[PDB]
Coordinates of C-alpha atoms and ligand atoms in Angstrom, one line a residue:
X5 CA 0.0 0.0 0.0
X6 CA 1.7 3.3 -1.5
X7 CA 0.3 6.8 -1.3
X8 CA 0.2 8.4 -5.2
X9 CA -0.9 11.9 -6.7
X10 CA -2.9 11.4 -9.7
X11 CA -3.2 14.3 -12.1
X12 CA -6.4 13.9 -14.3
X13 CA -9.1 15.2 -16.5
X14 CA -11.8 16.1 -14.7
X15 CA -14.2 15.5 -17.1
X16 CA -13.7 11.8 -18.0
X17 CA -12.2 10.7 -14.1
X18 CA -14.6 9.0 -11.9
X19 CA -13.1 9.0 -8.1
X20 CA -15.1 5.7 -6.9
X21 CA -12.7 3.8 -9.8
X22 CA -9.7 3.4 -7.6
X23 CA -11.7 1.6 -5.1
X24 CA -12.7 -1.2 -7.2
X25 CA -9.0 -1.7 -7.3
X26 CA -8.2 -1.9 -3.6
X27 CA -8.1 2.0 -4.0
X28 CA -8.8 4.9 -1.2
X29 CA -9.2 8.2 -2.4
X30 CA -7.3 10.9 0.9
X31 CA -7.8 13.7 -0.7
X32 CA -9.4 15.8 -4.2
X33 CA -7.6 19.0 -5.1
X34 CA -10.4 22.1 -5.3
X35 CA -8.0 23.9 -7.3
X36 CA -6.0 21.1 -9.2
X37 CA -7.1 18.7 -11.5
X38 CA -5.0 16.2 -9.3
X39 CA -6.3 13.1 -6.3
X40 CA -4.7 12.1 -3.3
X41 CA -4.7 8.4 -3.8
X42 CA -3.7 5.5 -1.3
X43 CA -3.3 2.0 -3.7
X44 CA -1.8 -1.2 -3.7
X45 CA 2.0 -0.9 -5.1
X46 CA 0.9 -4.0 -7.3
X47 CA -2.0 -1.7 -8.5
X48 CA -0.1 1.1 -10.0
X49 CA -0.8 -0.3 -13.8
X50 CA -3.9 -0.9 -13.3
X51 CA -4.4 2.8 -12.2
X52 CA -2.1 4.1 -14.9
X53 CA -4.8 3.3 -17.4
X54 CA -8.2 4.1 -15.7
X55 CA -10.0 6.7 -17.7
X56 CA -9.7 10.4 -17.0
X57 CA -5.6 9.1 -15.9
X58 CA -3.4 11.2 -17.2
X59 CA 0.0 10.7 -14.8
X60 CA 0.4 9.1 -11.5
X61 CA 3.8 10.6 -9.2
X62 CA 4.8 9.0 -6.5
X63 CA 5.0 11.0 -2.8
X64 CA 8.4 12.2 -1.9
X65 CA 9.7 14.1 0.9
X66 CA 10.6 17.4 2.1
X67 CA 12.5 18.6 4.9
X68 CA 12.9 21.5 7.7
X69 CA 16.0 23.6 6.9
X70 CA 17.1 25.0 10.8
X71 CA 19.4 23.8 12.6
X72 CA 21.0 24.9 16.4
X73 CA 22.9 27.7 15.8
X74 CA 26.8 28.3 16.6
X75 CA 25.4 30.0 19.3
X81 CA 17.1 39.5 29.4
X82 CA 13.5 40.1 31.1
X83 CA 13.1 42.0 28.3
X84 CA 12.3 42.3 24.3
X85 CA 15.7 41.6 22.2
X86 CA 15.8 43.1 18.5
X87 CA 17.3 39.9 16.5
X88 CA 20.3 41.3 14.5
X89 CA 18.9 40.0 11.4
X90 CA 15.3 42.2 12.4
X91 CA 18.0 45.3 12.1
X92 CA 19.9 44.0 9.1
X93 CA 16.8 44.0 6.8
X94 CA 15.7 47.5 8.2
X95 CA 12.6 46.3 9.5
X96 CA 12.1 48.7 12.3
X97 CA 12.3 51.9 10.4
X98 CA 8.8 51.1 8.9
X99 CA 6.6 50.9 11.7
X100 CA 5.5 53.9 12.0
X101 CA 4.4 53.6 8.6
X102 CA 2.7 50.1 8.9
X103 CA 3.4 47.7 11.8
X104 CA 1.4 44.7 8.5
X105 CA -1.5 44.9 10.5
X106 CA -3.5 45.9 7.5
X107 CA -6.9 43.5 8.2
X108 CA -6.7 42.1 4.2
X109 CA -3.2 40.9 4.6
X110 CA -2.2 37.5 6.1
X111 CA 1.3 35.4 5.6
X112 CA 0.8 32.0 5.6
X113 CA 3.8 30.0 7.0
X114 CA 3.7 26.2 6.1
X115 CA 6.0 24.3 8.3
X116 CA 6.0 22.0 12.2
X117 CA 3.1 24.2 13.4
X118 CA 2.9 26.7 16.3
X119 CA 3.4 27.3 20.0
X120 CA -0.2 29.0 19.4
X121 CA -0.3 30.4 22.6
X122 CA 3.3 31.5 22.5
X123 CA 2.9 35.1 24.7
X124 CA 5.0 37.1 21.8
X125 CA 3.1 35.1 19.0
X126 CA -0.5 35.0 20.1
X127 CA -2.1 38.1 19.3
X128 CA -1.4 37.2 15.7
X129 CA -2.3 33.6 14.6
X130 CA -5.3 34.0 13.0
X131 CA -5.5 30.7 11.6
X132 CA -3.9 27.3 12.9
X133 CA -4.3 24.4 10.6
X134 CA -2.8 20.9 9.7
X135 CA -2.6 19.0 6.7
X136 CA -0.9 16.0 8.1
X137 CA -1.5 12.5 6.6
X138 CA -4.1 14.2 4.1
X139 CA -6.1 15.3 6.6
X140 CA -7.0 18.6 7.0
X141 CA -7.5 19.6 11.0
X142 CA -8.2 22.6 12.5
X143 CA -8.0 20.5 16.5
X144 CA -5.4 22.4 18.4
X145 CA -3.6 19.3 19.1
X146 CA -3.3 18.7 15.2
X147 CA -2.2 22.4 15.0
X148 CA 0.6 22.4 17.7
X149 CA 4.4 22.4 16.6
X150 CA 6.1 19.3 17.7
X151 CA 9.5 20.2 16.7
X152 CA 9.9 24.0 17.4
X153 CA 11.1 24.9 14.1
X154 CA 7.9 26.3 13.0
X155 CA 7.3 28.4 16.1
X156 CA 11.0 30.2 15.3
X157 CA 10.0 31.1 11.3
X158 CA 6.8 32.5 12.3
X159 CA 8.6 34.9 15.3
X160 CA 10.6 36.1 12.9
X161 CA 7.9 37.3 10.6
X162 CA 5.6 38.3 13.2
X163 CA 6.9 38.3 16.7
X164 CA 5.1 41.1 18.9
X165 CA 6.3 44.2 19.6
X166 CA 6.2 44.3 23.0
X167 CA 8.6 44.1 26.0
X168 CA 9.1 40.5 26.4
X169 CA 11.3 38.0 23.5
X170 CA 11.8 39.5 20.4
X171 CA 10.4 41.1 17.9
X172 CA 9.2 40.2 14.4
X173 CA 10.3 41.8 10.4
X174 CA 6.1 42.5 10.5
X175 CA 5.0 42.4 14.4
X176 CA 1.5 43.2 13.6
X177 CA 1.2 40.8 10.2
X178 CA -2.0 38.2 10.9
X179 CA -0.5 34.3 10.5
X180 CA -1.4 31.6 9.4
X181 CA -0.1 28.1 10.7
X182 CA -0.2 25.3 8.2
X183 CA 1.7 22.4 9.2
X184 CA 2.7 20.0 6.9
X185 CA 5.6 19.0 8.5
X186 CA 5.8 16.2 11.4
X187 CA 7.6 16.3 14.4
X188 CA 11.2 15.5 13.0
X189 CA 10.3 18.7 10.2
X190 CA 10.0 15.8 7.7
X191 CA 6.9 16.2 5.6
X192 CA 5.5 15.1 2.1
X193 CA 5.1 16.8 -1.0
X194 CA 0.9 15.7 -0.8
X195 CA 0.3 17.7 2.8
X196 CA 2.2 20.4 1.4
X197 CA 0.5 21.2 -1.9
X198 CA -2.7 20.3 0.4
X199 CA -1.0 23.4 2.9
X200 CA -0.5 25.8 -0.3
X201 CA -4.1 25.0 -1.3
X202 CA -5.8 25.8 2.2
X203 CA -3.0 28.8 2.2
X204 CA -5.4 29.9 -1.2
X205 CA -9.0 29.0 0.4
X206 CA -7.8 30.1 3.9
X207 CA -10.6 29.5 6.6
X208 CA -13.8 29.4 4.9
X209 CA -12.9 27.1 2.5
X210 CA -13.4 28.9 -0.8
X211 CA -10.9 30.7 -2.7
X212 CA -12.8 33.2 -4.4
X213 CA -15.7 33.5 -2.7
X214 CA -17.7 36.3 -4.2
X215 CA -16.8 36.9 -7.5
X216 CA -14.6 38.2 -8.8
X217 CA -12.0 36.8 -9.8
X218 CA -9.3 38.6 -7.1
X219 CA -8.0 36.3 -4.3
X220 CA -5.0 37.7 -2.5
X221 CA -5.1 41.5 -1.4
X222 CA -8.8 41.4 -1.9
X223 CA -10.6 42.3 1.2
X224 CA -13.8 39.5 0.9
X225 CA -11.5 37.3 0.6
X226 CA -9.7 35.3 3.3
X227 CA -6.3 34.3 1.1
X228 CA -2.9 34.8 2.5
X229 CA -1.1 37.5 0.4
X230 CA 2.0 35.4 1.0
X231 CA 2.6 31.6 1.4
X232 CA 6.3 31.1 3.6
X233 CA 8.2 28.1 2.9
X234 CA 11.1 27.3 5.4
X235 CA 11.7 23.8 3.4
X236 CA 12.8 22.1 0.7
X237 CA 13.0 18.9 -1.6
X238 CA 14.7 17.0 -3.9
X239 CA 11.7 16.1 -6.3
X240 CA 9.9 17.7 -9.1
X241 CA 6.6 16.9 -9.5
X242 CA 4.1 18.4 -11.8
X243 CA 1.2 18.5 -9.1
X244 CA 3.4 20.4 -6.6
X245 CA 4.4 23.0 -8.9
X246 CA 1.1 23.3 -10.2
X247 CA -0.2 24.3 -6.9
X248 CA 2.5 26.5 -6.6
X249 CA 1.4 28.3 -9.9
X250 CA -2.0 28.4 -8.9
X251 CA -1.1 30.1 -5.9
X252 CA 1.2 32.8 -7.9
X253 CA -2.0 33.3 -10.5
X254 CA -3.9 34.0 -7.5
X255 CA -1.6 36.9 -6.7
X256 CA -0.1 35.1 -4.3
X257 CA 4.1 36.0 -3.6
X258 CA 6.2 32.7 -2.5
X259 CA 9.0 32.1 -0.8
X260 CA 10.9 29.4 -0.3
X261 CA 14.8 28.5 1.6
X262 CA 17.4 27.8 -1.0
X263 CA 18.7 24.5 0.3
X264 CA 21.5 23.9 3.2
X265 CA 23.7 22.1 1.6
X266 CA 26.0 24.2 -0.5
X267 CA 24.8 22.7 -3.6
X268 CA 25.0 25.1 -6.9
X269 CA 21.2 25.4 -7.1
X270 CA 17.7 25.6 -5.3
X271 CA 16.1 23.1 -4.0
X272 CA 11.9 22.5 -4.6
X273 CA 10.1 24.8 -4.1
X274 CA 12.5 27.5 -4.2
X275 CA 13.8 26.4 -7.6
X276 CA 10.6 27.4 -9.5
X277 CA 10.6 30.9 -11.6
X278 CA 6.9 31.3 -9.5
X279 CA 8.9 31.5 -6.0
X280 CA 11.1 33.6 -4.8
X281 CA 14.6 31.4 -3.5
X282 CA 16.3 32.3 -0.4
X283 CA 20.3 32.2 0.7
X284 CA 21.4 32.7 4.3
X285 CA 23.8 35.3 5.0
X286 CA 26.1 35.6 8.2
X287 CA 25.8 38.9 10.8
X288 CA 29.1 40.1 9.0
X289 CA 27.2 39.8 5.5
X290 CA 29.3 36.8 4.4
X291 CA 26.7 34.1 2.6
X292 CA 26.3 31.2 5.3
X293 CA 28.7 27.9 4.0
X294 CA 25.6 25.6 3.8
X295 CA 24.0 28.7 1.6
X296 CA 22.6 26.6 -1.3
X297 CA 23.3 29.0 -4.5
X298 CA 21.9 30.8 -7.1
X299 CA 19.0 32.1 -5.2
X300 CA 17.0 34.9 -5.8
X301 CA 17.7 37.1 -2.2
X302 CA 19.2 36.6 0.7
X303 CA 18.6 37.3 4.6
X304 CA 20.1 36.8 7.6
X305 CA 20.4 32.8 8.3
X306 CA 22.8 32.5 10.9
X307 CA 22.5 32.7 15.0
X308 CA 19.1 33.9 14.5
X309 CA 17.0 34.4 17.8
X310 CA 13.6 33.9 17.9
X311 CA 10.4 32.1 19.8
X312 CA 10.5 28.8 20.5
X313 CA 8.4 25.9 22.8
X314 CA 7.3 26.6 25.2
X315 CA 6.9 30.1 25.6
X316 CA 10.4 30.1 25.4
X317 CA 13.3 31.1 23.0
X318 CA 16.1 29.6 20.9
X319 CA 18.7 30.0 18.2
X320 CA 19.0 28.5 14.7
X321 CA 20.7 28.8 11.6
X322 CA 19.4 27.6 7.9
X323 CA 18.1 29.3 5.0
X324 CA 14.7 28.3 7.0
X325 CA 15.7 31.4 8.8
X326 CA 16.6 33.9 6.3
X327 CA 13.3 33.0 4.4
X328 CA 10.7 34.1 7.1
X329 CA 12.9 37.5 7.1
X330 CA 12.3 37.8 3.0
X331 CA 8.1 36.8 3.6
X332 CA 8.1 39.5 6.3
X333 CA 9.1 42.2 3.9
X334 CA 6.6 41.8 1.6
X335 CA 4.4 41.5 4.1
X336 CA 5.4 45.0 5.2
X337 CA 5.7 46.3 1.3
X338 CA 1.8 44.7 0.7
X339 CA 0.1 46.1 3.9
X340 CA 2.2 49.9 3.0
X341 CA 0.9 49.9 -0.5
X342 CA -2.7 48.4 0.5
X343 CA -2.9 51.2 3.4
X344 CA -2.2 53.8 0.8
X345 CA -3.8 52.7 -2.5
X346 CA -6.9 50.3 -2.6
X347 CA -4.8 47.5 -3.6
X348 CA -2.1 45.0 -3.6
X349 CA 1.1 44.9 -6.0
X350 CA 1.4 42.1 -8.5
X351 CA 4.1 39.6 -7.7
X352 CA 6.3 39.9 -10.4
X353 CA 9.3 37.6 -11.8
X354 CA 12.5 36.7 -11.3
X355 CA 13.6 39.2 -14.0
X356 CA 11.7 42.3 -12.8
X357 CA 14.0 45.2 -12.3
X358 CA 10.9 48.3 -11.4
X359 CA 8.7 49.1 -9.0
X360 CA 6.0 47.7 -10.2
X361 CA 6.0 45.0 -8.8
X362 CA 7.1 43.1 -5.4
X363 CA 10.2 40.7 -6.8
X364 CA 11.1 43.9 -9.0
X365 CA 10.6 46.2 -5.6
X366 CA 13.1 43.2 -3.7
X367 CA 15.2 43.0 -6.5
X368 CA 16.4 46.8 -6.6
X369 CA 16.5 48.1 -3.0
X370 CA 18.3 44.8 -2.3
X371 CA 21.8 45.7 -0.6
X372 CA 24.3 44.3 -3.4
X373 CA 27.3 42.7 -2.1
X374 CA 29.6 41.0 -3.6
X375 CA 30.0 41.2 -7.0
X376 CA 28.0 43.8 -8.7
X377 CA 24.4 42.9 -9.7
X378 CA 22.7 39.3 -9.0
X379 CA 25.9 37.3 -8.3
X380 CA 25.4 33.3 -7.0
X381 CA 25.8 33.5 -3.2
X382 CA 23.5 36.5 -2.7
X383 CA 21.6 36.3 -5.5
X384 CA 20.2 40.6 -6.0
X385 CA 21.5 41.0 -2.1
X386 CA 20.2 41.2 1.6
X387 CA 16.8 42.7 1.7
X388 CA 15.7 45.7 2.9
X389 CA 12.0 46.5 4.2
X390 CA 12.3 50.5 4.6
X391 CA 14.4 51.3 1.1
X392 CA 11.4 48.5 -0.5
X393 CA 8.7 50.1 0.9
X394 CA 9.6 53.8 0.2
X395 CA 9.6 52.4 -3.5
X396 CA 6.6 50.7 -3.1
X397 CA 4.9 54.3 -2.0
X398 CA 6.8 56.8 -3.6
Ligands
CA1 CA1 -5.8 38.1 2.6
CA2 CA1 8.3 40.7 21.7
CA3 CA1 -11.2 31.8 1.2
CA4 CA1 -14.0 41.2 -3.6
CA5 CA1 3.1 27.3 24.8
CA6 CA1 26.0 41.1 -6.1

């Protein structure tokens, strides 16, 4: 018995088929043409030429990308919260705009964390298929989750630390179990409850707007602190449906010095993150070629229970990258009506939120995109002021 993603036509595919075949359908895609599909491992064949089949991929895995770092009754600023020029904004938007949410898939949360709690809005689970809203589904096992989503959104306070966005609504999808190992099915099952966020419904209304649109209940930003070896077609075309939906991605680059992303980073749809050091020198585990990069190493954050902790990774520079355009969306939806389109990897305006990274970027290294830094370390105040201006 082997768990399979079957991408199909939706027109000629009849689910109760794979049970006359020793079949179990976990779980139909609203917004793929795709089924979550426990079989026999003898069965595959047979399932391979049902009608409406058009590809079956196997389940592969994905892991957490944080590790224990090198390396006060009070609230530290993480360096990496002043490297990326986070504070400098607030008094222009704390991301507490009510329309924007960042979804962070990834171990779950410490939900009741004291310096986290005032901003989950949401705390799901897609484990094993199953989508579950029951707290104890919800809760982070591992820890790593809890640090990620401080470091977007830890409060501003005078306890802990504080967060890139401190006022930023998230969501907690966990698709990763209690080792951060996870599968690429509950993650493209997380991406797509990212899209139709609480209610259930993507667009809900109309319309056809989805993130940045203020009926809906989308995140304007799914986090991804993770990464995989695969390529599958069904993964990626969740991640495009998400992007179409106006939807900015972001994904860690990979920890093992390797000369590329890893999945999901790798995609021209999400944005790929490197880990620099507090002395702006790109982390040795940095996987390369990415797109940005943030602080990644001896990063302090919130951790189980109620409690604090350490870590290096890209998994760490990401959440500083999502938090930014968390803070660039909420500035230009404050001011304007609206949200920016998410933009590609060759954008080089304003006009939209990769071109807006892209240019305010700090270059270091050698001039212009270069393979350890990719544009350069992010900046949230120089983004947003071209984002307004
Ligand atoms: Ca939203
Ligand atoms: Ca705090
Ligand atoms: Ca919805
Ligand atoms: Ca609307
Ligand atoms: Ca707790
Ligand atoms: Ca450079």
């Amino acid at each position: 018995t082997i768990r399979v993603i079957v991408s199909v036509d939706k027109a000629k595919f009849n689910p109760h088929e794979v049970l006359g075949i020793g079949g179990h359908i976990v779980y139909q895609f609203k917004l793929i043409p795709a089924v979550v599909v426990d079989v026999p491992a003898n069965a595959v064949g047979k399932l391979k030429k049902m009608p409406g089949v058009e590809k079956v991929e196997f389940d592969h895995q994905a892991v957490l990308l944080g590790k224990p770092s090198w390396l006060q009754p009070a609230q530290t600023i993480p360096w990496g919260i002043e490297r990326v020029k986070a504070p400098s904004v607030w008094s222009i938007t704390d991301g507490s705009v009510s329309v924007i949410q960042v979804a962070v898939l990834d171990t779950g949360v410490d939900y009741d964390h004291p310096d986290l709690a005032a901003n989950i809005a949401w705390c799901v689970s897609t484990l094993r298929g199953k989508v579950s809203t029951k707290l104890r589904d919800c809760a982070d096992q591992n820890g790593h989750g809890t640090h990620v989503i401080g470091t977007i959104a830890a409060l501003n306070n005078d306890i802990g630390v504080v967060g890139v966005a401190p006022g930023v609504q998230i969501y907690s999808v966990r698709v990763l179990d209690a080792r951060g190992s996870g599968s690429y099915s509950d993650i493209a099952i997380g991406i797509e409850q990212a899209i139709l966020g609480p209610d259930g419904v993507a667009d809900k209304d109309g319309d056809g707007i989805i993130a940045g649109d203020p009926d809906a209940d989308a995140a304007e930003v799914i986090s991804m602190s993770l990464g995989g070896p695969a390529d599958d077609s069904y993964l990626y075309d969740m991640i495009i449906q998400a992007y179409n939906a106006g939807i900015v991605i972001v994904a860690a680059s990979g920890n093992e010095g390797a000369p590329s992303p890893s999945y999901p980073a790798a995609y021209p749809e999400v944005i790929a993150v490197g880990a620099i050091d507090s002395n702006d020198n790109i982390a040795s585990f940095s996987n390369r070629q990415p797109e940005v990069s943030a602080p990644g190493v001896d990063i302090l954050s919130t951790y189980p229970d109620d409690s604090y902790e350490t870590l290096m990774g890209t998994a760490m520079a990401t959440p500083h990258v999502s938090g930014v355009v968390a803070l660039i969306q909420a500035a230009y939806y404050q001011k304007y009506g609206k949200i920016l389109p998410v933009g590609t990897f060759d954008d080089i305006s304003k006009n939209t939120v990769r071109g807006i990274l892209h240019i305010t970027a700090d270059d270091l290294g050698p001039t212009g995109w270069d393979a350890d830094y990719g544009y350069g370390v992010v900046r949230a105040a120089l983004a947003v002021q071209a984002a307004l201006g």
